[PDB]
Amino acid sequence: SMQPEEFAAAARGGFGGDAEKAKAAEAQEAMRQQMEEQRRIMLRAVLTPAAQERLHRIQLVKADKAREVEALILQNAQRGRLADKVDEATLIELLQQTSAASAAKNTPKVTMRRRFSDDDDDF
Numbered sequence: 146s147m148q149p150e151e152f153a154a155a156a157r158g159g160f161g162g163d164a165e166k167a168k169a170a171e172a173q174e175a176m177r178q179q180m181e182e183q184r185r186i187m188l189r190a191v192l193t194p195a196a197q198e199r200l201h202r203i204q205l206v207k208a209d210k211a212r213e214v215e216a217l218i219l220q221n222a223q224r225g226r227l228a229d230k231v232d233e234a235t236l237i238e239l240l241q242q243t244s245a246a247s248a249a250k251n252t253p254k255v256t257m258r259r260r261f262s263d264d265d266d267d268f
Contacts, residue, residue, distance in 0.1 A: 178230045190225020197222075203242070209253065214238050 146165060147154045160166035200218075204211035217234045221227055242248065247263035249255055 180229060182230075185229065186225050186227055189228050193222075193226065207242075210242070210250065214242070 147163060154161055154163055156163075156166075159170060200214075204214065207214075217232060217238050220232055221235060241250070249260075249263070251260060
């Protein structure tokens with residue numbers, strides 16, 4: 146789908162300017178999920194949990210940390226709650242802040258030089 150044929154793309158790598166390629170190409174892979182989206186994924190979008198609460202709070206203080214946390218949820222809270230094809234980073238962040246109980250990371254300038262396993266420190 147790139148004319149003229151004489152001066153076609155012939156990239157053979159991913160896209161090379163042709164936004165279309167990135168669309169279809171990525172689709173072939175994303176299709177791995179093989180399931181209902183516009184129907185199921187959308188059917189869930191309707192309702193919504195109350196996570197916004199804790200999120201609005203934890204984010205109220207962790208601004209810089211909230212921007213990185215929203216990056217992921219951006220494809221879940223807005224995507225209509227996949228509740229099936231949930232990304233992988235979704236949990237990576239939920240644990241980066243406190244998989245169970247810990248909090249704190251290393252900013253803003255909150256790290257007193259070399260952190261420590263909160264759980265271990267038991268303090």
